[PDB]
Amino acid sequence: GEKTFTQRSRLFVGNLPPDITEEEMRKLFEKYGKAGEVFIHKDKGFGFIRLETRTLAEIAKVELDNMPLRGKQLRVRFACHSASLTVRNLPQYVSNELLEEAFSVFGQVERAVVIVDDRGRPSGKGIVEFSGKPAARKALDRCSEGSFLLTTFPRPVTVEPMDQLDDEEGLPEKLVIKNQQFHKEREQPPRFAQPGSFEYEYAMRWKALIEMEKQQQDQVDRNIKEAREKLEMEMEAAR
């Protein structure tokens, strides 16, 4: 069998009544087998619960999301992996196992992956998921203050907290801030600006500014590439 009670079967439970208890949380999820850790953020209106398997968490999520509880409409979602980090500027020859081994010095690593592009080539980016937040904080502090080298090449990696973006639920119409400016903005429907109009001119000038940003960022890429190839030469010659 697979490892149970992992962060893959951990659910976020939001919009909780202010009087919620850990036993009430357990009673809410009782049908979905055994429950592990329950943790409620007091006066914040949110909590976490670990279910035994990914199947049980998937089912509980669909079935319990939006459930009315004492005037509240509960929000049940897969919990964002809090103790997760993004690792940038990975050198060559870094396997998922080496990444796990490297970061295992800061604490218990649940998983580590070297990201590969749509053709299996390494992206230079990786993900490190710790079991707990203190271990992830250690890796962040130590890798910023010191130079953490994964291989022979003395180029240290950049470790940043994982950017937590809700690309699942996003921005529903019901949650958009409704005001006069909103209604003014919605008076014109989705359309293509027509050539000759003021809006076509403005939108085309807006596209040109976007194209200018793109060109300037591509110039920085070229300058940094050149700077890096020069440093690699100086380092090899000074050896």
Partner 1 sequence: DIKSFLKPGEKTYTQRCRLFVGNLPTDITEEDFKRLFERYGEPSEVFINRDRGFGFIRLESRTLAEIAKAELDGTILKSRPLRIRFATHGAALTVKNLSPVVSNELLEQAFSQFGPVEKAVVVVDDRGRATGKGFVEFAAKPPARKALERCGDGAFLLTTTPRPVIVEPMEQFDDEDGLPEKLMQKTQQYHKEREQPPRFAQPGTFEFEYASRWKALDEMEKQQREQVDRNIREAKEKLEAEMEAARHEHQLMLM
CA distance 218 to 216: 5
Site string for partner 1, 109-148 (x = CB under 8 A): ----xxxxxx-x-xx--xx--------------x---xxx
Contact residue for partner 1 among 4, 5, 22, 91 (CB under 8 A): 91
Q: Is 237 in the site for partner 1 (CB under 8 A)?
A: no
Residue 235, C-beta contacts closer than 8 angstroms, at least 6 positions apart: 154
Residues 21-60 contacting partner 1, CB under 8 A: 53-55, 58-59
| CB-based contact 90:159 (threshold 8 Å) | no
Least distance from partner 1 to the Cβ atom of residue 52, Å: 12
Does residue 180 touch partner 1 according to CB under 8 A?
no
Residue 105 lies near partner 1 (rule: CB under 8 A): yes
Q: Report if residue 101 touches partner 1, rule: CB under 8 A.
A: yes
Per CB under 8 A, the segment of 21-29, 44-52, 68-76, 193-201 that binds partner 1 is 193-201
Q: How far is the CB of 37 from partner 1 (least distance, A)?
A: 20
Give 196's DSSP letter: T
Q: Which two tokens stand for residue 182?
A: 């909103």
Stretch that binds partner 1, among 27-35, 40-48, 133-141, 154-162 (CB under 8 A): 154-162
H or E element in which residue 6 lies: none
* Cβ-based nearer residue to partner 1, 19 or 167: 167
Q: How far is CA 225 from the centre of its chain?
A: 28
- The DSSP symbol for 212 reads H
**Residues numbered 196-225 forming contacts with partner 1, rule: CB under 8 A:** 198-207, 209-210, 212-213, 216-217, 220, 223-224
- Which is nearer to partner 1, 23 or 146 (by Cβ)? 146
Asked whether 83 and 135 are in contact (CB, 8 A), the reply is yes
Nearer to partner 1, 21 or 197 (CB): 197
- The DSSP call for residue 137 is H
3-class secondary-structure state, position 77: strand
Residue 81 CA to its chain's centroid (Å): 8
Alpha-carbon Rg for the chain in angstroms: 24
Query: In the Cβ-directed half-sphere of 41, how many Cα atoms lie within 13 Å?
Result: 9
**Least distance CB 35 / partner 1 (angstroms):** 18
Q: Is 68 in the site for partner 1 (CB under 8 A)?
A: no
